[PDB]
């Protein structure tokens, strides 16, 4: 049993959940109250996947998530929404304030008499589980609780449980639009919890979204229900390999096996080539090169970085739907010989490949279009380093006067938590600095003996 | 009377064993659930080689499957000849490997062997005479190579007699599926160059050209890869189970192949592959068979022989024929292509006939050659293995499980040892 | 340097005294002529070693070689040059019968004891001999078989598994996990050296009633420090002795083996077979590019293709002073296996090495620095330029 | 009053030899083959 628990954190994190979930109910056919005809009709089989949801003996599903917030409303508008039988009852919900964008007020003044709740509640998760493989973390990168409690939570479960993977996707501030003044210090006092404890960790930006939502699938006003379910999207189609049969499957190990070479670079972009409407999804033949190639073009990039700038150091394409293994090979062979694309000279290979059968599926109500094939790239590359030094410039500019700090040590931090924390931000920077380079010419220096 | 026990480790392994038994099943008759249903009497009289007799008159495979993901064994058994098999030899537990030769080896694979060793012995007391084992895996993967070695050095412990065959899908020189495959292909081919007595190279490159030219296959699957396999498979160990003018056993062909210990990686090759198409233009006749087996397209391993030289070359027939157009032509490719063949091993092309052919053909042929030219593969595979290991470029993941860069250090040297080895044969004019 | 070679002729045995004893070695200061049985009208075709040693007549005293006299030509040799800093390798050779283990090991009850006694001895009254305040010594020992392809460990207690092998980059060939252990006394080591001859594979035979199933590797790692904190280095020399005892090849007809018996007959001959074909290959590699231009192209050794020849890489060559002390069957019975014995010891008499040995190489560039700038400042005072 | 201090190394014995010998060999022998005497 391939099974994982979800942990959504925030309202980000809230909202992505329920997208997420409305995606994998619609896939394995199970109704918003738990229930799934589809047994009933044929007579039985594997459809109550235990990847994510847990059955009963009655025959009700219940979903391996845990949600936890400091404000009452995110989590209400779920307690009484179309999906209000689907969940266990508990959510973890802490009837008090919020952590009002302040780190220290949810790692360490209200971010306790919660943590507790939340950790047993996993456990009981764990107990159930035969075969954890690793955990789903949604947060995001700027509010309060999402980096504050989350940087908690992952300590605590990397005390715990010490081995179980544990992936994060997060929500990474984008270059120019913001919707908070204080988001560059919780952005930066998250980096000692992301990089010690998370094995790895998936950046997206809105702004790149909203591009791609106004290119690609012709919206001209999107709401965050379409990001959420883009990137529900992103996360089905790296969560399909241990649910569903294929001809290569990709398990949650393989992916940190050849995704990360050094412990401390595990920082992949993710994409999703085949965006596009309805009415755009007739005149292409979307053929498994064509979709190859999107995964590369910089404007599909889900961060406001230019691969272009950078090398890549590893590539993992998770193939959907009918595609054969022939012309994956020969799209990677054609990547492979254009200019634009740099590997670093260390990695040969450059390239895991896997693929699986299940197309993807159509929400209701939904923007993309129903396609045959599809395909999810993550990269591992060195243009990152441009979407950290940014943010590092703001934060110079708010710490030399100290704005804004009064706050963040009325609830038991120091000045100092923050100047360390930059500093290791940029032994970060440099250590991507220092792999990016190319090896040393005739790295021996020079040689050749006698004969 | 000779048996073969049969083990199958990893999805590469899994499923080229699960087309090999659909093919072996086909040639003798045993219909998907054991029961024989055949028309010739010669059918029955030598299926002691694979299969054990059940006490209701069935027949059940001598075969032994393990992985680390019950996946592959679902889908084994979710399929045509899924029920054939016992339930008892299937051998898993869980949380693969994950791509990662020290998981295969050394953390995961350690549990798992005893169960392993345990079938095997087994299923080896129960043999009248047993002659050797055959094992089907991929170098580049995890459970594949790492389990396939551990249980390749075990027995070879336990029986140091018997044959030790082995059917290895090596990395592709431009073709890749997954990052860090030098380095499991490294330290694999470093525990095969000990431990096994043959070992026949196979690459997907290969296949595929193979299915694009020759077989003229819009869009081929693994389906066909493995009944290419399959077929070289069978035809390998024909003389075992069939009569044939001039029969030749696995140790017969050991003998006539290798001249020294450490050089038993073989270039397989199969004949007549036409292109349904093209088969009511091309005459089946001994000179066509030699001339297809012979040619440098035709070869599952990807290495170019007209490189190199053939230290051994062995050609099994299966079909009504004659031995002096067969001998007149063996003797003809040699004098022909004089530059091709060392000058020091005279008549250097081991011959044997069997005179059963396949289901519904006329005629066909295997080609086993031994040549200089598989050297190229072994230096592709240390280049990218430089590439990585001069920076350490994923090594944490291997020294977390146990492991340490003497074992590395130690497998580089062995592979470049093996390709000095095979160079120094490599050039003419022995004298200066 | 090259390899030194001794050969050693052996008295008549039962058998051999039983059926025709016609003797056909003589031997004459540095030189041995063997006859042709069959062919007496052939010429009397001789070879010339470094050391010949005629132990044919044991109670005359007319050219007769004793146990010491062997050891005083060989051994103290070997010692003192592992003393001045050289790894030392001794390793016998021959056919069943022809007396290695007597050449090496001896008897212990009587005062003709083989090589290794007398040595580790000596080294013994000669440590303890010139300890110092300063000076101080320390030896460990270790002692391993090759029984079929396999290492087994001969002091360590009952343990019926088998040892790995390794490759150490600088160091080369070693093996994983011997028991190596420490001796400060003489009683100590006799009593690894009684342990050791007891574990040993020991099987009776037509050709000896006491032949040899396995290899056998004596080492002592011998370790030199000097203290003083204004002159001296400590831990300032390592080296190895290296002291070999190898089975001898068998013939099935007249060797009467069955069974597990014939498996180690078999399994001898491979490894023996693969030690002469390394030896070939050396002698010739070394003595074209010595003789025929220099071009050092390349030359393949098949040091793989046995446990026997990887373990003793560096001593066959390279970093190693070596010594071949073949033993010599007299009877003329034996006499196709005496040639090949006398053949390849012709060959091994072709075979260099390059050893050096040195130690803490920081320290070995340090010194040769100061060494340059000594001589720099030198030469620069006596030309004026300092 | 925040002032630079930049980062203090602290190197090993055997290498600052290894170096300062290094320089002076090279700065005798430059002196040596600079007038014809090597
Ligand atoms: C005209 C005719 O009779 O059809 C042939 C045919 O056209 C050809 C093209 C067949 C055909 O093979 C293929 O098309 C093919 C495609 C991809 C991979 C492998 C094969 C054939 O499928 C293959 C099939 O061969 C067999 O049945 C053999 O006994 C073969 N076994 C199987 O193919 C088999 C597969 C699944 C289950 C049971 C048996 C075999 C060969 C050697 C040793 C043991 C078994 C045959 C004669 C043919 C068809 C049907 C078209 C060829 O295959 C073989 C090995 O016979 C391809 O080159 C040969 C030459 C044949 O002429
Ligand atoms: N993509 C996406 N981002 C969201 C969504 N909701 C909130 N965000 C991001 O969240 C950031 C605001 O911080 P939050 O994560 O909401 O903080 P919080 O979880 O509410 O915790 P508090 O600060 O204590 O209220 C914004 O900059 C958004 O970019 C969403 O639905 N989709
Ligand atoms: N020079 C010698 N003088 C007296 N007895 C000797 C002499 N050399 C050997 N022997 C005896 O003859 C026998 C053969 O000696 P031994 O050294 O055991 O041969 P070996 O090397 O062991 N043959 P192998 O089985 O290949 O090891 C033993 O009984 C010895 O005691
Ligand atoms: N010939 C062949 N090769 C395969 C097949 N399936 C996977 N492979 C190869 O196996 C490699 C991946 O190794 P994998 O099978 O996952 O190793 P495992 O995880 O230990 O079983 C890839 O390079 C593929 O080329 C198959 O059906 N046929
Ligand atoms: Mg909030
Ligand atoms: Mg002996």
Same mark, same amino acid.
């Given at each position: ?451 | ?40 009497? %010669? ?95 991929? %170098? ?24 030790? &065959? ?170 022909? &292509? ?9 008549? &250097? ?84 | ?10 008295? $008549?045995?039962? @058998? ?74 001794? $390793? ?129 790692? $011998? ?76 030359? $393949? ?75 720099? @400042? ?9």
């Amino acid at each position: 049993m391939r099974e994982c628990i979800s942990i959504h954190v925030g309202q980000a994190g809230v909202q992505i959940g329920n997208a997420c979930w409305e995606l994998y109910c619609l896939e394995h056919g199970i109704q918003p109250d738990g229930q799934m005809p589809s047994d009933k009709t044929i007579g039985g089989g594997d459809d109550s996947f235990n990847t994510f949801f847990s059955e009963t003996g009655a025959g009700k599903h219940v979903p391996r998530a845990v949600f936890v917030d400091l404000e009452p409303t995110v989590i209400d508008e779920v307690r009484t929404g179309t999906y209000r039988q689907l969940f266990h009852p508990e959510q973890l919900i802490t009837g008090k304030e919020d952590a009002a964008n302040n780190y220290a007020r949810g790692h360490y003044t209200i971010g306790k008499e919660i943590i507790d709740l939340v950790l047993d509640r996993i456990r009981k998760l764990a107990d159930q589980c035969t075969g954890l493989q690793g955990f789903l973390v949604f947060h995001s990168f700027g509010g309060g609780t999402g980096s504050g409690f989350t940087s908690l939570l992952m300590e605590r479960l990397s005390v715990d449980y010490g081995k179980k993977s544990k992936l994060e996707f997060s929500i990474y501030p984008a270059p120019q639009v913001s919707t908070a003044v204080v988001e560059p210090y919780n952005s930066i006092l998250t980096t000692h919890t992301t990089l010690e404890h998370s094995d790895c960790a998936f950046m997206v930006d809105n702004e790149a979204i909203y591009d791609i939502c106004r290119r690609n699938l012709d919206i001209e006003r999107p709401t965050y229900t379409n990001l959420n379910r883009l990137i529900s999207q992103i996360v089905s189609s790296i969560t399909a390999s241990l649910r569903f049969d294929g001809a290569l499957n990709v398990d949650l190990t393989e992916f940190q096996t050849n995704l990360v070479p050094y412990p401390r670079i595990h920082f992949p972009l993710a994409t999703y080539a085949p965006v596009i409407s309805a009415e755009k999804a007739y005149h292409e033949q979307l053929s498994v090169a064509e979709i190859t190639n999107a995964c590369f073009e910089p404007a599909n990039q889900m961060v406001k970085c230019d691969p272009r700038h950078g090398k890549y150091m590893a590539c993992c394409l998770l193939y959907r739907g009918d595609v054969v293994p022939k012309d994956v090979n020969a799209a990677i062979a054609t990547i492979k010989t254009k200019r634009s694309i740099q590997f670093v000279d260390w990695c040969p290979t450059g390239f895991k490949v896997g693929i699986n059968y299940q197309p993807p599926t159509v929400v209701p109500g939904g923007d993309l279009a129903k396609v045959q094939r599809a395909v999810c790239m993550l990269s591992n590359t060195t243009a990152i380093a441009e979407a950290w030094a940014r943010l590092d410039h703001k934060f110079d500019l708010m710490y030399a006067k100290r704005a804004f700090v009064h706050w963040y040590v009325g609830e038991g931090m120091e000045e100092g938590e923050f100047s360390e924390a930059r500093e290791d931000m940029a032994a970060l920077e440099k250590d991507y600095e220092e792999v990016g380079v190319d090896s040393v010419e005739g790295e021996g220096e020079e040689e050749g003996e006698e004969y | 009377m000779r048996e073969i026990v049969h083990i199958q480790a990893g999805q590469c392994g899994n499923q080229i064993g699960a087309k090999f038994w659909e093919v072996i099943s086909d040639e003798h008759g045993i219909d998907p659930t054991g029961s024989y249903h055949g028309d010739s009497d %010669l059918q029955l009289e030598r299926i002691n080689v694979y299969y054990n007799e059940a006490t209701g008159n069935k027949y059940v495979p001598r075969a032994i499957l393990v992985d680390l993901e019950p996946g592959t064994m679902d889908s084994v058994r979710s399929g045509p000849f899924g029920q054939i098999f016992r339930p008892d030899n299937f051998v898993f537990g869980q949380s693969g490997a994950g791509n990662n030769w020290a998981k295969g080896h050394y953390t995961e694979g350690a549990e798992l062997v005893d169960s392993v060793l345990d079938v095997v012995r087994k299923e080896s007391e129960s043999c009248d005479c047993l002659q050797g084992f055959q094992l089907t895996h991929s %170098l580049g993967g995890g459970t594949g190579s790492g389990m396939g070695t551990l249980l390749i050095s075990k027995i070879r412990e336990e029986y140091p007699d018997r044959i030790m &065959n082995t059917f290895s899908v090596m990395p592709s020189p431009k073709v890749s599926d997954t990052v860090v495959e030098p380095y499991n292909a490294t330290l694999s081919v470093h525990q095969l160059v000990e431990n096994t007595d043959e070992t026949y190279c196979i690459d997907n490159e290969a296949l595929y050209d193979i299915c694009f030219r020759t077989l003229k296959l819009t869009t081929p699957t693994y389906g066909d890869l493995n009944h290419l396999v399959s077929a070289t498979m069978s035809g390998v160990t024909t003389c075992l189970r069939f009569p044939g003018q001039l029969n030749a056993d696995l140790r017969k062909l050991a003998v006539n192949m290798v001249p020294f210990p450490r050089l038993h990686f073989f270039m397989p090759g199969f004949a007549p592959l036409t292109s349904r198409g093209s088969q009511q233009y091309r005459a089946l006749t001994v000179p066509e068979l030699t001339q297809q087996m012979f040619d440098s397209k035709n070869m599952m391993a990807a290495c170019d022989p007209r490189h190199g030289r053939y230290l051994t070359v062995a050609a099994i027939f299966r079909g009504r024929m004659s031995m002096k157009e067969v001998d007149e032509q063996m003797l003809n490719v040699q004098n022909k &292509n004089s530059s091709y063949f060392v000058e020091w091993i005279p008549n &250097n092309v081991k011959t044997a006939v069997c005179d059963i052919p396949p289901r519904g053909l006329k005629m066909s042929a295997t080609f086993i050659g031994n040549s200089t030219a598989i050297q190229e593969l072994f230096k592709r595979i240390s280049e990218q293995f430089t590439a990585m290991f001069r920076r350490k470029a994923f090594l944490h993941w291997y020294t977390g499980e146990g492991m340490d860069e003497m074992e590395f250090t130690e497998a580089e040297s062995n592979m470049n040892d093996l390709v000095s080895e095979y160079q120094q044969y490599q050039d003419a004019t022995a004298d200066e | 340097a090259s390899v030194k070679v001794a050969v050693r002729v052996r008295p $008549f045995n039962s @058998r051999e005294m039983s059926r025709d004893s016609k003797c056909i070695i003589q031997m004459s200061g540095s030189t041995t002529t063997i006859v042709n049985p069959k062919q007496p009208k052939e010429t009397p075709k001789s070879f010339s070693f470094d050391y010949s040693y005629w132990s044919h007549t044991s109670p005359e005293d007319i050219n007769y070689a004793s146990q010491k006299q062997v050891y005083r030509d060989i051994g103290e040799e070997m010692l003192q040059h592992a003393f001045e800093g050289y790894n030392v390798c001794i $390793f016998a050779y021959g056919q069943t019968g022809a007396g290695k283990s007597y050449t090496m090991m001896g008897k212990q009850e009587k005062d003709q004891q083989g090589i290794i006694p007398q040595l580790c001895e000596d080294l013994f009254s000669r440590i303890n001999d010139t300890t110092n305040d300063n000076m101080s010594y320390s030896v460990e020992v270790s002692y391993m078989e090759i029984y079929c392809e396999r290492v087994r460990d001969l002091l360590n207690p009952k343990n019926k598994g088998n040892l790995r092998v390794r490759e150490h980059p600088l160091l080369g060939p070693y093996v994983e996990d011997l028991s190596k252990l420490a001796v400060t006394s003489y009683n100590d080591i006799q009593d690894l050296m009684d342990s050791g001859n007891k574990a040993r594979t020991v099987a009776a035979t037509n050709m000896n009633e006491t032949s040899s199933r396995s290899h056998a590797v004596f080492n002592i790692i $011998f370790t030199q420090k000097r203290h003083d904190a204004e002159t001296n280095i400590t831990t300032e020399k390592v080296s190895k002795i290296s002291l070999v005892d190898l089975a001898g090849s068998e013939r099935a007809d007249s060797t009467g083996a069955k069974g597990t018996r014939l498996k180690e007959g078999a399994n001898i001959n491979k490894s023996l077979t693969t030690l002469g074909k390394v030896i070939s290959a050396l002698a010739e590699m070394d003595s074209g590019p010595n003789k025929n231009k220099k071009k050092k192209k390349t030359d $393949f050794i098949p040091y793989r293709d046995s446990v026997l020849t990887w373990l003793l890489r560096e001593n066959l060559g390279g970093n190693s002073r070596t010594a071949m002390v073949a033993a010599l069957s007299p009877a003329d019975i034996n006499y196709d296996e005496t040639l090949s014995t006398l053949r390849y010891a012709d060959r091994a008499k072709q075979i260099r090495c390059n050893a050096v040995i040195n130690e803490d190489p920081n320290n070995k560039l340090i010194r040769e620095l100061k060494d340059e700038v000594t001589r720099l @400042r030198d030469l620069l005072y006596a030309q004026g330029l300092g």
